[PDB]
Amino acid sequence: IVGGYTCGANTVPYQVSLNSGYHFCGGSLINSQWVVSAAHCYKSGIQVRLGEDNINVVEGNEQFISASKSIVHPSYNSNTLNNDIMLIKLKSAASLNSRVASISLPTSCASAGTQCLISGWGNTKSSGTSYPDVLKCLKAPILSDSSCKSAYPGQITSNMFCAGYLEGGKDSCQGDSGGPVVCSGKLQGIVSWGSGCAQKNKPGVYTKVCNYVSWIKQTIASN
Template sequence: MAPFTKKKLKKVFLLLHLISGLEDDEKIVGGYECPRNSVPYQVSLFTGYNYCGGVLLSDQWVLSAAHCKPRFRLGEHDIWEPDHTEQHIMSAAFIRHPDYNPRTQDSDIMLIKLSQPAILNNYVRPAVLPSDCGSAGTMCQISGWGNIRPSDEGSRYPDKLQCLEVPLLSDDTCFNAYPFQITENMICAGYLEGGKDSCQGDSGGPMVCEGQLQGVVSWGHGCAQRNKPGVYTKLGPTTPSRSVTPIVYAE
């Protein structure tokens, strides 16, 4: 059976969100509303609702998960209200990693070229690719507009960008959580006790550790479940999945 990617069942969850109404101040599965414009490299892949996340790498290139389908909003915070910092840009080209496997989610990474350069400013700014691999225990920030409830509590989608700090987990811990499913292109982050995680709608979004982009949201078994941390496509300097990124800097 294929892994449960973070965008599956999104349309069903959107319907539940629309009928749920306003509730108490819950956050992205244990997270919080990001300070406005504090994640300037965050991209919303938007098709009438936030479908996936992405990461700005340069004024013309966005990185996301290979299983996502993109249209772009940059400089976004509240996806339903004008922030006057947004840039809406169409896509011009897609480059999925040649080794992407939709069954296993290996090499779940994609580059998208924008149809026109983004205007870089305080609200729209590229992320920094890592010069080394993050170590277990390093705290990282993830962000997105995905589901803010654990899998066993239904769904609710926020209007405003949500953030969460999660620790990188060791390769052994990651493998033990998902036996024979973790490849060299994957890294786990999160809490084994559950309660805090990325979720549906966060796919392709950034995991930034000590100022460097160490991964993008990829998959997991449910959201915020005990002993099932989030799985991210690894972007360390020697990781095979990163092999598509040099094209960004060759232009």
């Protein structure tokens, strides 16, 4: 997250870290056994880390759980990042508490100008590299479809939306992928892609979770 702030330990209790001997992507806890993340984060060997704040120190309130199943959307296209969504089933159910809690899926899609919270352990620099230890937060609005398509002509599908700031300086970035975009207590986005980070007129692009609610619920009911 570039231009953001230190969230505060366990203030984003649904945020997870996906780990393979290092943090590589985020995700969101949507019930005691299931996490949503981005398809482009898919790997073998994933450990889900819940209740994290500093990803480099064991502080308390952490739960480390292996992934059992990792379900990439069948129509994921890795060249376009259309359908950039994955479900991950935990080996065991997490213990939910004030520090470790699920986020609700949307009933309706969000509209333009809705303010959301994006969070992650990704790069904090637009130009260069600097990974945080502790979780970073950014409040960003949903842009209009118009401004989103004018920023990325031909590359925005019905399953995406833009969020952020056209002036630059505030965005998600590498390592934030897969994490939450929460608006009025509902999971509306997943950190997906963009052109660089925090660059002017190139806002971040997010998977529009409201298009996937039926798919999420049908897949989970069968797995």
